[PDB]
Ligand binder design. Structure first.
Ligand SMILES: Nc1ncnc2c1ncn2[C@@H]1O[C@H](COP(=O)(O)OP(=O)(O)OP(=O)(O)O)[C@@H](O)[C@H]1O
Ligand SMILES: [Mg+2]
Length: 288
């Protein structure tokens, strides 16, 4: 875990040039950087506008990510920490962007999307039980899944992690377990829920925003998928991502099986949700 200066990160990011921006939110800007010539991502918190959650998310990401390692997790290289000037994480650069960009001939066949689910599941199994204490990520969603030079998925963005010991929901709310969104309850099951929603979006191509139908009742992504799965393989086909090739029985059957797993993950009651271990198990049977 190297500590970097402002000047070092300024130089690496070409003076934080707009053309090096590879990612943005209200709370941070992520820059491509080059330090032995190692390519990195520099996640720079927005200290000027949002000092106190910049601090919370900075320290959370730094404390959490510096203790963890796994092939399906983002990797921290170092940080810069100069109050009032810069707080930044220096991360392994992931050349193929994030899963949100990948979702919204194509490489993203049913098998390749199943592979991403498996990879993310490995990351989440490690978070929940591979370290000395369970780490709950709390923001599982496609924009927090990055892609390798080998298109291997990596769980990223630990700014909301906790260590234990038109639309229907806009922005990121559609990914959140109800007990997490409404009461900030944190358990490993909140990540199981979000993983279910991620998998649904990955195979339908639909953000989990949902829709207010015209009686004013919201149709969640989960309910859309539940209705399709209940209508059999032909129902599932109707709801799958139109940009995804679904030609063989095997590809449709595999996608149907993922959505059935995703529906169990997104159960309303936390106790009805499987653990990530059983989720991984189901997905590993489906990669055979
Ligand atoms: N290591 C990395 N390599 C390449 N791109 C990255 C990396 N980390 C982040 N990005 C890009 O930056 C975007 C946002 O970064 P990140 O999610 O870490 O912080 P955030 O924007 O504050 O979180 P959120 O978007 O959930 O509010 C990602 O969607 C991704 O496209
Ligand atoms: Mg974040």
């Amino acid at each position: 875990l190297r500590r970097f200066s402002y000047g070092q990160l300024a130089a690496a990011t070409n003076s934080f040039d707009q053309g090096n921006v590879i990612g943005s939110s209200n709370l941070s800007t992520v820059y491509k950087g080059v330090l032995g010539g190692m390519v990195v991502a520099v996640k720079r918190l927005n200290l000027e506008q949002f000092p106190s959650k910049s601090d919370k998310c900075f320290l959370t990401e730094l404390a959490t990510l510096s203790r963890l390692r796994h092939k399906n997790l983002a990797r921290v290289v170092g940080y810069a920490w100069e109050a009032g000037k810069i707080k930044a994480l220096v991360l392994d650069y992931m050349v193929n962007g994030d899963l949100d960009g990948a979702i919204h001939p194509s490489r993203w066949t049913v098998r390749e999307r199943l592979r991403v689910c498996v990879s993310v599941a490995h990351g989440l199994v490690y978070l929940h039980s591979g370290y000395d204490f369970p780490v709950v990520h709390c923001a599982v969603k496609p924009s927090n899944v990055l892609l390798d030079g080998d298109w291997e998925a990596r769980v990223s963005d630990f700014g909301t992690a906790r260590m234990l010991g038109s639309s229907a929901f806009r922005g990121t709310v559609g990914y959140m377990a109800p007990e997490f969104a409404y009461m900030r309850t944190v358990s490993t099951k909140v990540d199981v829920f979000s993983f279910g929603v991620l998998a649904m979006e990955l195979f339908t191509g639909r953000r989990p925003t949902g829709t207010i139908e015209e009686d004013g009742v919201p149709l969640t992504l989960q309910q859309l998928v539940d209705n399709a799965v209940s209508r059999g393989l032909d129902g599932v086909h109707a709801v799958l991502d139109p940009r995804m090739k679904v030609a063989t029985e095997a590809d449709l059957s595999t996608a149907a099986d993922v959505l059935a797993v995703a529906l169990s993950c997104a159960a309303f009651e936390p106790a009805d949700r499987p653990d990530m271990g059983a989720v991984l198990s189901s997905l590993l049977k489906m990669s055979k």
